[PDB]
Design an enzyme around this catalytic site. Structure first.
Site, PDB file in Angstrom:
ATOM      1  N   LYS A   1      -8.829   2.572  -1.742  1.00 37.21           N
ATOM      2  CA  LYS A   1      -8.415   2.986  -0.232  1.00 37.21           C
ATOM      3  C   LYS A   1      -8.582   4.193   0.268  1.00 37.21           C
ATOM      4  CE  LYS A   1      -4.672  -0.214  -1.457  1.00 37.21           C
ATOM      5  NZ  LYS A   1      -3.193  -0.572  -1.412  1.00 37.21           N
TER       6      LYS A   1
ATOM      7  N   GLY B   1       4.859   1.283   0.853  1.00 35.45           N
ATOM      8  CA  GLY B   1       5.727   1.980  -0.244  1.00 35.45           C
ATOM      9  C   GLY B   1       6.049   3.300   0.130  1.00 35.45           C
TER      10      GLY B   1
ATOM     11  N   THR C   1       0.838  -1.403  -0.056  1.00 29.35           N
ATOM     12  CA  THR C   1       0.078  -0.060   0.108  1.00 29.35           C
ATOM     13  C   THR C   1       0.922   1.132   0.115  1.00 29.35           C
ATOM     14  OG1 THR C   1      -1.882  -1.121   1.161  1.00 29.35           O
ATOM     15  CG2 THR C   1      -1.957   1.342   1.150  1.00 29.35           C
ATOM     16  N   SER C   2       0.599   2.249  -0.911  1.00 32.97           N
ATOM     17  CA  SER C   2       1.057   3.568  -0.851  1.00 32.97           C
ATOM     18  C   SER C   2       0.044   4.626  -0.621  1.00 32.97           C
ATOM     19  CB  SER C   2       1.789   3.602  -2.372  1.00 32.97           C
ATOM     20  OG  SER C   2       2.847   2.773  -2.321  1.00 32.97           O
TER      21      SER C   2
END
Ligand SMILES: */C1=C\C(=O)NCC/C=C/[C@H](NC(=O)[C@@H](NC(=O)N[C@H](C(=O)O)C(C)C)C(C)C)C(=O)N[C@H]1C(C)C
Ligand SMILES: [Mg+2]
Ligand SMILES: [Mg+2]
Ligand SMILES: [Mg+2]
Ligand SMILES: [Mg+2]
Ligand SMILES: [Mg+2]
Lengths: 222, 195, 212, 125, 204, 233, 196, 226, 195, 196
Positions: free
Chosen positions: J33, J130, J1-2
């Site tokens: 997200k 990330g 996830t970023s």
């Protein structure tokens, strides 16, 4: 994993005389190889001519002393300001300690004072509350260094009268408060030399019919 | 504890139970009676973890004696064994289970028949002509399989029991200090004082 | 630790050593291992010191409440069972106890119950408990008779603790003797093992292995 | 390859002579003179620095060698053989003594170790 | 489980005026069980004395090893080994087993025959040398011995006074240790006389 | 039982003749990641007390809210809330010490080491320590974490015992504290250059200094250091 | 640790911080992580300080013996010797090494040898705990055939950020420039690179 | 244990405390931690005491043989290289943490070395349990171009910080000064700030106090003539 | 195996060793002789891990018999015990140590004295008037401490030994199936066939 | 996830990738997200998908009930409710949440709530696996009071790099713009952001 216990070092010593009692302890507080304080009082006047020390894990030690002091206060409230005798205090501390039998106060407790006949008294406790009246008791880090010396120099163990060669023991003559203090100071000076957690200062509380008196002495700071 | 045996013959049930009580290193006693009379015609022997054995046995005894007084009536051996099984089956999923195995030897006065029940600590019940708990069966069942007859007299049952105990005394590593033998029949419960 | 108690013609003899250890370190040589429950009942200390002390004093309180309510001395059977039922409630929690509850009543006569922290309660004539129990059993078993005199029984108990004190590293200090009669227990003194060993060696001719 | 000479090159002749040792002593006889004298408060050892060429710097060639702080050595005979013996003698003083007892060996025992090395070159393969 | 405290026992050494003293208890046990009351832990090779505490099989083995080595030393050197030299030999011998050590606490005591100087030394199980001027302690009651020695000791004690000091140091230390006692021996060592004294003590 | 996540490093402090000094850097670490660079870890309570906190930052923020609530609660039905019945350093510490020991006794500790610095009503200096175990102690100098190992030795050279306190001025004390913060920046891998410093004096009151920096650093000698042994270039 | 090597028009430059930690304690704040295995073949070290020093010493020995027999070794040859040691002893080593060198024939070259002992020839390389925080920045800002001044600025700015975020990195920024002109050492202090 | 090393104008100085411990017990109150590798190469050790002694003597022995072989005075870099390669080979199991200092024909040198075999270069260094206390003092007072007197002062002050503040350190300060073109001067017990005070009582016993069972003469002499 | 006892009296050494061999669940044998004659006047009893006991004992026996033939001379009990100790001390740091404890009872024909040596698997040797291995000493040493005299006859030694075995049979949990008793004196080694 | 949130002149913008993994398998390549807890208060989620959804749902419920009684909540209030849930249930949660919102009084605000349940008000915030790779880039390139277009470019470039290096990040770059003008959703596809 969280470890709820710690070791603050320190060494304490109680000796019962004929009409007096002393409770001594060093003033050094430590964790691992560091010094927290060179002067952190460890022996306390709890009222009613009773002195107390709970050596080992200082958080538990402070908690127990605080709860016992509180017990003395409420004993007065509940029983018409009656003086808490040293034997009654000892039984009370057993119940305080055994109350946490399955999550113990990690301390070795010693109290000192005078019994109801005016004679010197020392009581010694394990962490979960088993106790005994004793004449002589060292506690904490350097207890193993001090007790054998006290067996020899207070109770005259293994000492016999010259000329008889083992047939007649050295008689157990009573020691004065000045004599006891000498043995306490030499016990702690010797412990300071050979134990890294012992040093900085020595505070002695002396109990007589006249009340509680304090004496302080410097110890080596290395 | 260790060895408990049971044999149902023609007209009676015979229970044999060892006398030794061992706490690790030392044999503390050599005359221990590992049994409780639940009712005049029902006897229960027991073996398992220390403390729990006697606690459980006396608990059962109290409950059956309570029933006897309330109803002025003796429960059948079958009824008593079912009550005992349920207690153990309840116990096995408890916080701390009773680690106790039992034999129940009773004479049913209604049917005029001896009855032997074997129940382990899980609540596993079986009615048998002869039974045991622990390692006792490993040594004794081959002898019982060979000699047992349903029409045996009490005296023949005792003789077959002696042969079982002799084999145990020969091949078992532990000294169980002999057995106390008790007979359950129409007249009630009695102990064989020479065995 | 070494504790024993045995029934005989004149009542019960209770004998114990006085040593307490923490690992190899001898914490005390002056431990009181006979708990004076009341003037008629005695208990012995083995296993956990606190567990024994605390719960056998507590037992004394329960016995006192019993005789206040029932206007009659509590039986040894009932007293021992109060303790065994209590420790059975705590089973699994980690109590450590091995004790002999000793008494002498009208209905029972001299009676000893071995009570233990995993719930065991055994009536018997001779019991020994502790790290030095095996040594004391040897002397007891070979010399015990029902028709011992009070004097000889007291010595037998003393001699059996001495045997254990010698061989068992974790037993010693001194020997405490008690004699339990129907009218109550009688204390028969503290006996330093150091002085007792040499005294017995000379008078008895035993311990020829040891140079004196 | 491999050292296939696992047999003695020094052997007894019919007359009882060990030829190679006698011939080694002959090589010593041809060598430059060296001497030693013991006094009450010291010992002296000396020899001639027979320079092979005047262009050679004879200070760089040490005939007298320190073995330990309190022991010195000089020779007569084959210089290269001496040089390696000095290396071995210096090392054996450490390995078979100083690393064990925490002090330098006494003269007689270091001599004994050097002697052993020379004996083995007289019997080994 | 801990090899250095299976058998139990203690050794203590002290220096005095033109004299040294070395002392030990006589117990050998198997944990709680007392096995022997005649297990002496002090040995001597010529005029050099060696006490050894710890695992008893290693105590016996090392004694036999140092007898072996000092006997060869003497044949080659044509003289008895000295305390200073023997101390280095003990250290060397222990460190050669660096990763598989003897579970012992050796103590050397003696007087140099040439200088007349009193000498004591202690070792860990791996060879580290503690060369104290005053006293050396070793064994399962080493804490107790440190406590006794540190208070009882004073420098330049005469042989017969040193005997009382070291005896009382050992005895009272042993009586606070479950795995020490069952008798005791004290060696009083002078330049050309050695006296050996067995002490009377409690047998529990 | 938990583990600390976002953490603050050393808090250091000492007594001087007229009061106390306390200091702590402005970093909130996330393991080896120097995540948050503007975190205030000295929290004043009134004008007589400053509480310095190291360890878990989420627990620090919780303690900060407890102290804020304590001030509100003390003011309730209290006409002398800004005078005789104002919060003392000793009151604030004893409260925190109670909470810390209670939380460790429930096996759910506030994962912190705390130093309460202040001046009492009678002018007395107050300096005491408490941590996640409920362990408490007092000393002329107090420090947490790395500060205990590196700051205390330096601060103890100024005030080595009780009798040195009256001989120590505020200038000498602050100088010692500032130097100790520089040493910690050299040697603690979870420290930052930016820090806050608070002085509580019985005469001049509470002086709170923000955005201080470590300065006068020695790095020039690094140019001569080459290789790890034999390397010359 | 934050280390990198960058090829440019005139050759290659190696860069490194100077922090060495034991846990949270900075055991050395002025460490030299740029090590010389040959005249114009250097390396940056990360991982176990004992392992990477032992490896570098062995490589220096190998390249010295190579030079005596076969003349100046290539950067590829040096990287191969590093790889041989790292790959064959992968079970017992914790070493992440960047090899950088200047030939006249091949000019500036960079090789990175991560934990496993693999080799990767690259225009530039980054490694060490602090490198994670500058993958984005370095990828966006790297150009091929930069000038000396541009490359110094790139490495200075990159390691500045790595130092800023990584607690295991810090101290001074050391650099070594490898060109035909020779070998130049550079050093940049905190007061310089922190204000960038 | 607190050990330090400090470079100065014309040489280098090393220092150490004198406490050796076994757990919380002080084994020796006046331990010697400054070790001679060669006449002008000395090092101070922390960690396992037998290891620091053994590894010093082994390399010291081999350094001496090397000096005799090459007809040259030993170099610090040689001692450093031989120590690190030995320690690396044993993968940290030989628990020797050393500060190596000395003077040789190349000049004056100061290095540290860790048990796993890594080495460092510096102008001031500290090792042991009291190294943080010592380094605090060094980082506060060190400067370039220190004199001999200033360096001795700084080094001993750094050891004192360890003595007073670290429980693992105590007793006395040992110093060794190695100056270029001079003999190395080993200053054993350079400072003595921890003498025990007189005891309150004499514990000398009356003769005959101890009970004795048997007496006998021990034959320490060899088998006699005649 | 389990219990091995030894007692040195006036003119002889008496060794008592249990007869049981138990492999976990069953007692495989009740007549096992846990001893080997090393020389005409030297006997060794043994107990420890299965297989290793007999392997070690026979290995020692072979070595002493080899010495006897080579020199035409019987080694002293002291010499034999020292050889045995060294073998066990060597063994304890081996790849797989001998897990064997022994008693060595011998009559020294030169000194005209009986001698008893106790050696455990670590190589821990002690000369004793009486000894044991395992838990045997825990039960028997208090009796031996009381009754033992150095001037006891062989018959008195056997009587004291009977008392020791009786105590073992009372308080030990394991059934060791009695003991084989052997006497070592000036005339050699003989077995008491009724005990 | 970023994930990241960035304040700018006109308000605040939230950004996120769309990759959800179970080990190395991409269980959802088009995940959203960016979740809405109030009209102009949104959040970015990282950590356990179950935990962060459960938390967000509870927060949305709390702010809905707040609004019915007291009117529009502040961004600070929303962050506090998130913190209360994360801090009190820290033993049983794995959640890293960034809270972003627009008031008219306070304008754009960003709060980050890491694992422990602490709160940190920041000009911009980055989180998720990330984020590690763009600490350097974001610190160098962030300015205060950027325009909408500049902020979109900053987030696009930042998450581009995070996606490039992090295997746990990928798919599309989603963005939500929060200003006085309203709520605008943006999406950027691989062919767009990979060539940056
Ligand atoms: C400096 C202190 C330290 O650097 N570290 C503290 C650990 C102390 C080590 C050392 N003490 C010893 O070596 C003692 N022996 C010992 O520890 N032996 C180990 C054992 O567990 O018994 C074995 C070898 C694993 C010895 C003094 C009795 C010590 O004091 N180090 C000092 C300094 C280097 C003397
Ligand atoms: Mg110190
Ligand atoms: Mg003892
Ligand atoms: Mg004993
Ligand atoms: Mg979950
Ligand atoms: Mg990706």
């Amino acid at each position: 994993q969280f470890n709820p216990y710690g070791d603050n070092g320190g060494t304490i010593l109680g000796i019962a005389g004929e009409d007096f009692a002393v409770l001594a302890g060093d003033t050094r507080n430590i964790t691992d190889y560091s010094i927290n304080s060179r002067y952190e009082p460890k022996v306390f006047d709890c009222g009613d001519n009773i002195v107390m020390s709970a050596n080992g894990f200082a958080a538990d030690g402070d908690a127990l002393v605080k709860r016992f002091k509180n017990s003395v206060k409420w004993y007065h409230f509940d029983h018409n300001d009656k003086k808490l005798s040293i034997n009654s205090a000892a039984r009370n501390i057993q119940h305080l300690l055994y109350g946490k039998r399955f999550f113990p106060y990690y301390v070795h407790t010693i109290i000192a004072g005078l019994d109801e006949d005016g004679k010197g008294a020392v009581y010694s406790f394990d962490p979960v509350g088993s106790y005994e009246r004793e004449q002589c008791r060292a506690g904490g880090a350097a207890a193993s260094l001090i007790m054998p010396f006290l067996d020899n120099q207070v109770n005259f163990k293994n000492q016999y009268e010259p000329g008889t060669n083992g047939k007649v023991k050295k008689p157990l003559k009573y020691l004065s408060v000045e004599e006891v203090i000498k043995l306490v100071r030499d016990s702690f000076t010797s412990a300071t030399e050979r134990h890294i957690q012992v040093g900085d200062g020595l505070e002695i509380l002396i109990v007589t019919k006249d009340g509680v008196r304090k004496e302080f002495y410097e110890l080596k700071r290395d | 504890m260790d060895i408990i045996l049971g044999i149902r013959v023609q007209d009676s049930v015979i229970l044999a139970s060892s006398k030794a009580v061992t706490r690790g290193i030392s044999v503390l006693k050599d005359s221990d009676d590992k049994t409780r009379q639940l009712s005049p015609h029902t006897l229960m022997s027991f073996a398992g973890e220390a403390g729990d054995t006697v606690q459980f046995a006396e608990y059962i005894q109290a409950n059956i004696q309570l029933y006897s007084i309330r109803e002025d009536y003796e429960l059948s051996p079958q009824a008593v064994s079912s009550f005992v099984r349920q207690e153990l089956a309840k116990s096995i999923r408890s916080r701390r289970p009773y680690q106790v195995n039992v034999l129940i030897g009773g004479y049913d006065k209604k049917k005029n028949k001896p009855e032997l029940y074997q129940i382990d600590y899980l609540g596993t019940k079986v009615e048998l002509p002869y039974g045991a708990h622990g390692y006792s069966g490993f040594y004794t069942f081959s002898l019982l399989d060979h000699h047992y007859r349903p029409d045996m007299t009490t005296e023949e049952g005792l003789d077959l029991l002696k042969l079982c105990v002799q084999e145990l005394e020969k091949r078992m590593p532990m000294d169980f200090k002999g057995v106390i033998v008790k007979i359950v029949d129409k007249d009630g419960i009695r102990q064989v004082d020479d065995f | 630790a070494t504790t024993l108690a045995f029934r005989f013609q004149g009542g019960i003899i209770v004998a114990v050593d006085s040593r307490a250890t923490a690992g190899n370190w001898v914490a005390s040589q002056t431990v009181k291992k006979v708990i004076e429950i009341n003037p008629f009942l005695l208990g012995t200390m083995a296993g956990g010191a606190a567990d024994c002390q605390f719960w056998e004093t507590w037992l004394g309180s329960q016995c006192r409440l019993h005789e206040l309510r029932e206007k009659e001395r509590i039986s040894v059977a009932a007293a021992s069972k109060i303790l065994s039922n209590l420790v059975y409630q705590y089973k699994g929690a980690g109590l450590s106890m091995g004790t002999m509850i000793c008494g002498y009543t009208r209905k029972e006569g001299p009676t000893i119950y071995y009570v233990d922290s995993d719930g065991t309660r055994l009536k018997g004539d001779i019991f020994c408990v502790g790290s030095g129990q095996t040594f004391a059993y040897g002397v007891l078993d070979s010399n015990y008779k029902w028709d011992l005199s009070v004097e000889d029984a007291l010595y037998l108990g003393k001699r059996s603790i001495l045997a254990a004190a010698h061989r068992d590293a974790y037993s010693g200090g001194s020997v405490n003797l008690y004699h339990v009669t129907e009218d109550g227990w009688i204390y028969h003194g503290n006996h330093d093992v150091g002085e007792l060993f040499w005294k017995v060696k000379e008078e008895e001719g035993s311990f020829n292995n040891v140079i004196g | 390859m491999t050292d296939r000479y696992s047999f003695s090159l020094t052997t007894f002749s019919p007359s009882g002579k060990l030829g190679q040792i006698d011939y080694a002593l002959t090589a010593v006889k041809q060598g430059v003179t060296s001497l030693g004298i013991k006094a009450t408060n010291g010992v002296v050892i000396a020899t001639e620095k027979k320079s092979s060429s005047p262009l050679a710097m004879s200070e760089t060639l040490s005939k007298v060698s320190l073995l330990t702080p309190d022991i010195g050595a000089v020779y007569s005979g084959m210089g290269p053989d001496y040089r390696v013996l000095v290396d071995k003698s210096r090392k054996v003083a450490h390995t078979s003594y100083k690393r064990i007892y925490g002090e330098y060996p006494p003269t007689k025992l270091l001599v004994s170790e050097v002697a052993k090395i020379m004996q083995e070159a007289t019997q080994s393969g | 489980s801990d090899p250095s405290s299976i058998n139990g026992g203690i050794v203590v050494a002290m220096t005095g005026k033109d004299c040294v003293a070395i002392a030990c208890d006589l117990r050998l046990g198997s944990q709680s069980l007392g096995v022997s009351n005649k297990f002496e832990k002090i040995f001597h090779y010529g005029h050099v004395f060696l006490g050894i505490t710890g695992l008893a099989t290693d105590v016996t083995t090392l004694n036999e090893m140092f007898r072996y080595k000092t006997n060869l030393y003497k044949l080659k050197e044509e003289r008895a080994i000295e305390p200073e030299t023997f101390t280095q030999l003990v250290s060397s011998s222990l460190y050669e087993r660096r990763f598989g050590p003897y579970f012992v606490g050796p103590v050397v005591a003696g007087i140099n025959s040439k200088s007349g100087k009193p000498f004591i030394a202690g070792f860990d199980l791996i060879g580290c040398i503690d060369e104290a001027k005053d006293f050396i302690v070793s064994g399962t009651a080493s804490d107790q011995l440190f406590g006794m020695c540190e208070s009882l000791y004073e420098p330049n004690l005469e042989p017969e006074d040193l005997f009382e000091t070291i005896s009382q140091a050992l005895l009272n230390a042993a009586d606070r240790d479950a795995l020490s006692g069952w008798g005791a021996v004290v060696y009083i060592i002078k330049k050309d006389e050695v006296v050996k004294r067995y002490l009377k003590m409690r047998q529990d | 039982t938990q583990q600390p996540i976002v953490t603050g490093t050393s808090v250091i402090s000492m007594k001087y003749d007229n009061g106390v000094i306390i200091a702590a850097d402005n970093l909130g670490s996330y393991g080896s990641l120097l995540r948050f660079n503007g975190v205030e870890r000295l929290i004043p309570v009134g004008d007589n007390t400053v509480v310095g906190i190291s360890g878990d930052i989420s627990d620090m923020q919780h303690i900060e809210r407890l102290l804020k609530d304590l001030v509100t609660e003390n003011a309730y039905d209290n006409p002398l809330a800004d005078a005789e019945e104002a919060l003392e350093p000793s009151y604030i510490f004893e409260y925190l010490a109670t909470v810390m020991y209670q939380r460790r006794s429930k096996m759910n500790p506030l994962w912190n080491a705390i130093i309460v610095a202040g001046v009492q009503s009678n002018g007395d200096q107050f300096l005491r320590y408490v941590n996640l175990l409920g362990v408490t102690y007092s000393s002329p100098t107090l420090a947490t974490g790395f500060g205990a190992h590196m700051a205390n030795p330096l601060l103890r050279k100024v005030v080595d015992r009780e009798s040195d306190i009256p001989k120590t001025t505020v200038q000498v004390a602050e100088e010692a504290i500032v130097n100790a913060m520089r040493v910690l920046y050299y040697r603690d891998a979870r420290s930052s250059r930016n820090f806050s410093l608070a002085i509580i004096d019985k005469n001049t009151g509470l002086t709170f200094k923000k955005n201080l920096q470590v300065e006068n650093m020695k790095w020039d000698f690094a140019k001569d250091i080459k290789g790890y042994g034999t390397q010359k270039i | 640790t934050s280390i990198m090597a960058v090829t440019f028009k005139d050759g290659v430059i190696l860069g490194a911080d100077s922090r060495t930690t034991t846990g949270a304690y900075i055991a050395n704040r002025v460490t030299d992580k740029l090590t010389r295995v040959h005249d114009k073949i250097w390396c940056c070290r990360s991982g176990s300080a004992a392992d990477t020093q032992a490896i570098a010493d062995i490589v220096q020995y190998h390249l010295e013996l190579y030079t005596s027999q076969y003349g100046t070794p290539s950067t590829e040859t040096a990287a191969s010797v590093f790889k041989e040691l790292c790959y064959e002893n992968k079970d017992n080593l914790t070493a992440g090494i960047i090899v950088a060198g200047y030939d006249d024939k091949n000019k500036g070259e960079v090789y990175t040898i991560p934990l496993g002992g693999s080799v990767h020839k690259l225009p530039y390389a980054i490694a060490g705990s602090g490198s994670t925080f500058i993958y984005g920045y370095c990828d966006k800002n790297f150009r091929e055939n930069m000038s000396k001044e541009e490359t110094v600025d790139f490495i200075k700015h990159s390691l500045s950020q790595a130092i800023k975020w990584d607690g295991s990195s810090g101290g001074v920024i050391r650099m070594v420039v490898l060109t035909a002109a020779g070998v130049e050492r550079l050093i940049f202090y905190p007061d310089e690179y922190e204000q960038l | 244990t607190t050990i330090v090393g400090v470079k100065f104008n014309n040489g280098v100085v090393i220092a150490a405390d004198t406490r050796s411990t076994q757990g919380p017990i002080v084994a020796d109150k006046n331990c010697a931690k400054l070790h001679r590798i060669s006449p002008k190469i000395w090092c101070a050790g922390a960690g396992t005491a037998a290891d620091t002694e053994a590894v010093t003597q082994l390399i010291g022995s081999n350094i001496e043989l090397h000096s005799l072989y090459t007809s040259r005075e030993p170099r610090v870099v040689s001692a450093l290289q031989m120590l690190k390669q030995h320690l690396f080979k044993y993968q940290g199991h030989i628990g020797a943490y050393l500060i190596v200092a000395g003077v040789d024909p190349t000049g004056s040198h100061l290095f540290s070395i860790h048990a796993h075999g890594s080495t460092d270069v510096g102008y001031y260094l500290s090792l042991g349990s009291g190294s943080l206390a010592a380094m605090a003092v060094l980082e506060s007072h060190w400067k370039q171009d220190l004199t001999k007197e200033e360096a001795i002062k700084l080094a001993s002050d750094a050891i004192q910080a360890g003595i007073w503040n670290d429980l693992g350190s105590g007793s006395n300060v040992d110093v060794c000064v190695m100056e270029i073109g001079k003999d190395a001067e080993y200053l054993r017990n350079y400072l003595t700030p921890n003498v025990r005070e007189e005891k309150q009582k004499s514990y000398k016993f009356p003769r005959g106090t101890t009970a004795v069972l048997k007496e006998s003469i021990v034959n320490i002499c060899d088998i006699q003539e005649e």
